[model samples]
Target chain A: SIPGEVAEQAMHWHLELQEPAVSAATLAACMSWRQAHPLHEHAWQRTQVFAQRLREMR
Target chain B: GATSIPGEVAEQAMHWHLELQEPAVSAATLAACMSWRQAHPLHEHAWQRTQVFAQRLREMR
Candidate 1:
């Protein structure tokens, strides 16, 4: 199971990327964040899978 | 034009999505979202729609 904190953080980043117009600063910060830890990228990939599932459900 | 969904439900869905996306989300926030999602099927559906929208964008790549 994904750690609760990691899952929560993933959700937060997923939300940020969904903004109407994510600024360059936000993108850089997110890139730096994903680089900070492998788990961050893992969490992001999970969201992508979830997003795919949601689309398939459509 | 507004959505067919009830105004209140739509508003709550947006709030939940935004709340989840904050840079520093808390366990309490996730808990509250769980409760809110359970509050109504519409709430969950709204989030599902958001995911679908995101998925469609990815398909463009």
Candidate 2:
């Protein structure tokens, strides 16, 4: 049940970065968001590489 | 004269979207995206390339 892959990952990372610490609650929030859009999990799997590659380039 | 699409990303994107069902590059979209890229190359490059690859994917008819 993929939701909206790109959009969800975008929002997840946005929220993740907005906060200083990534706590269990943060992960849970991400997970809950993912539950709302399973498609995001799929997209996140792909986009994670995108983010990592950006970091690697830095 | 460069016979291919002008921008490196655009050229690469055209090739990527070769198999796509959607229209790959409209002059307007390409130009607009390029203009936006000029404002912020690095960030736009990431999204543009993502879009290039995404647009390139072959979707079922």
**Highest TM-score against the true fold, candidate:** 1
lDDT for each candidate structure: 0.67, 0.46
Q: Which stretches of candidate 1 lie over 4 Å from their true place?
A: B1-61
Give lDDT: candidate 1, residue A32: 81
CAPRI grade of model 2: incorrect
What i-RMS does every model get? 8.1, 10.9
lDDT of 2 by residue, B23-46 (tens): 332323322333333444553454
lDDT tens digits, residue span A1-58, model 1: 3455676666656667766899888889888877888977876676656655554653
What local lDDT score does residue A24 receive in model 2, on the 0 to 100 scale? 88
Best by DockQ: 1
Docking quality band of candidate 1, CAPRI definitions: incorrect
For each candidate, what TM-score against the reference? 0.49, 0.36
In candidate 1, the residue pairs with backbone N, CA or C atoms under 3 Å apart (3 or more residues apart, or in different chains) clash, namely none
Q: For model 1, how does the per-residue alpha-carbon lDDT over B1-61 read when each residue is reduced to its tens digit? A: 4355577887888787777656555544555564566557787677778657767977998
